[PDB]
Amino acid sequence: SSEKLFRIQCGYQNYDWGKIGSSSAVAQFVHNSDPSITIDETKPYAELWMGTHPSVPSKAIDLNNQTLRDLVTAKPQEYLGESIITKFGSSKELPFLFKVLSIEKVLSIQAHPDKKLGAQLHAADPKNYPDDNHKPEMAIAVTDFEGFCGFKPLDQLAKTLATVPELNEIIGQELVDEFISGIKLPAEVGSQDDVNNRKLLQKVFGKLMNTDDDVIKQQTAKLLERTDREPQVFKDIDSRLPELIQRLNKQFPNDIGLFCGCLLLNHVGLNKGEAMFLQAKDPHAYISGDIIECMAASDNVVRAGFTPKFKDVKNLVEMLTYSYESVEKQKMPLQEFPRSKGDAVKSVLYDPPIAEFSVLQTIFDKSKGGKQVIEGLNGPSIVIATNGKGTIQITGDDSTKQKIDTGYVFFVAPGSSIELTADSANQDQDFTTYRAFVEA
Numbered sequence: 001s002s003e004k005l006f007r008i009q010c011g012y013q014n015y016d017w018g019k020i021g022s023s024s025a026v027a028q029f030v031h032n033s034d035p036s037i038t039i040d041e042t043k044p045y046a047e048l049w050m051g052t053h054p055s056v057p058s059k060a061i062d063l064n065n066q067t068l069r070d071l072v073t074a075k076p077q078e079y080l081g082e083s084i085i086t087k088f089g090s091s092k093e094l095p096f097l098f099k100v101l102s103i104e105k106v107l108s109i110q111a112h113p114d115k116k117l118g119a120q121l122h123a124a125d126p127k128n129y130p131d132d133n134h135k136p137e138m139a140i141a142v143t144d145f146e147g148f149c150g151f152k153p154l155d156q157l158a159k160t161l162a163t164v165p166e167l168n169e170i171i172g173q174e175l176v177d178e179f180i181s182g183i184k185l186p187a188e189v190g191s192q193d194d195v196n197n198r199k200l201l202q203k204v205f206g207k208l209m210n211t212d213d214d215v216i217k218q219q220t221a222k223l224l225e226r227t228d229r230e231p232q233v234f235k236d237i238d239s240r241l242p243e244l245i246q247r248l249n250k251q252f253p254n255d256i257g258l259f260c261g262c263l264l265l266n267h268v269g270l271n272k273g274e275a276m277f278l279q280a281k282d283p284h285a286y287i288s289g290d291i292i293e294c295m296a297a298s299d300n301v302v303r304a305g306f307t308p309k310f311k312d313v314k315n316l317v318e319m320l321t322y323s324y325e326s327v328e329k330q331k332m333p334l335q336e337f338p339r340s341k342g343d344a345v346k347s348v349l350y351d352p353p354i355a356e357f358s359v360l361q362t363i364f365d366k367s368k369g370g371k372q373v374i375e376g377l378n379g380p381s382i383v384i385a386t387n388g389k390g391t392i393q394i395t396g397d398d399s400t401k402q403k404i405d406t407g408y409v410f411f412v413a414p415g416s417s418i419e420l421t422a423d424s425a426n427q428d429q430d431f432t433t434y435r436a437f438v439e440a
């Protein structure tokens with residue numbers, strides 16, 4: 001067995017919003033990795049955790065069933081490397097958490113502080129703000145995905161305000177008026193028109209979010225009747241909207257999220273392989289699908305809807321950036337990755353503008369197959385195969401050559417070069433892997 005490249009059996013969570021049983025990628029992955037585990041066709045399999053989180057350990061099946069957190073702790077310079085220990089200040093764990101999510105029901109509409117606000121919140125409200133940190137997140141579609149991300153373009157918001165009586169009602173004709181009159185559209189970031197546009201958005205949002213519950217309850221009922229009686233009004237805004245409203249109301253009846261999610265945020269569809277970065281102080285929600293998720297260790301969340309939990313409206317309204325870019329702008333650009341070479345038809349770097357993590361996407365054509373060699377990286381890595389099957393090894397050392405099937409996950413030590421080959425015989429799917437890493 002190698003201590004440089006080794007397989008880990010990862011734990012999972014059965015949260016009630018997860019896809020049920022084997023319809024869930026989490027379930028599929030868990031099962032394939034350890035068929036010993038019989039999937040309960042009745043239960044939700046929400047998340048697969050990969051890393052050094054104390055609550056849900058990843059066990060080194062070949063290294064005596066030891067915990068990755070344990071191995072790391074035991075040998076930090078070997079598993080983390082100097083530069084990482086130094087940079088993040090830990091010797092016990094990874095600076096990121098890597099997961100698979102299998103979403104059946106919408107999660108909360110939420111935003112995360114930057115480090116500066118994170119420390120502020122933590123000092124003032126430790127009960128709601130567990131840590132001191134920011135919480136960058138990145139989502140990559142495994143299966144087709146839907147979510148909310150950012151405010152819609154202002155012109156879309158003006159159309160919504162003028163056209164949807166129930167919203168118009170809540171905001172107030174004076175305010176609607178002011179908004180629709182006020183916004184300076186061909187306007188670029190940092191301009192006085194950009195600034196004043198955000199002030200207008202903030203007023204509108206604040207008015208909505210401070211509305212009493214009773215009113216929300218009333219207005220949401222009316223909204224649903226309208227989706228039913230006059231679908232065209234909604235379709236004129238976005239062809240998916242009326243059915244989205246109806247779907248989410250079935251999950252969270254008369255929730256404010258029907259307003260502040262469905263009417264104010266971009267409804268983003270990610271094709272498999274596409275990504276979105278969830279920056280600080282930007283509203284978003286996961287609606288449905290199977291994704292790869294990477295994030296920093298924080299628990300700091302400010303919630304706006306689709307939740308039973310505490311909604312800190314005060315902080316919410318003041319912290320947002322009130323950015324209003326397109327749905328198209330919500331998706332990450334493809335980056336090249338010089339330190340990988342070979343036959344893969346897709347070898348893409350997803351580099352968020354934060355330090356804690358990066359992801360490398362490697363895809364082989366099911367037909368073409370082939371090999372890819374990746375240089376040794378200056379930090380720890382976790383590799384998961386989401387589709388197809390192949391082999392993984394330390395470049396040039398065939399004694400390390402192992403099976404990597406769908407759902408298999410590996411730890412790769414800093415400095416180890418990896419060679420991937422796509423299953424010669426098996427050509428069902430494109431052999432697809434995701435590697436989460438960090439370099440200082």
Ligand SMILES: [Zn+2]
Pocket residue numbers: 110111112137278284
């Ligand atoms: Zn989030």
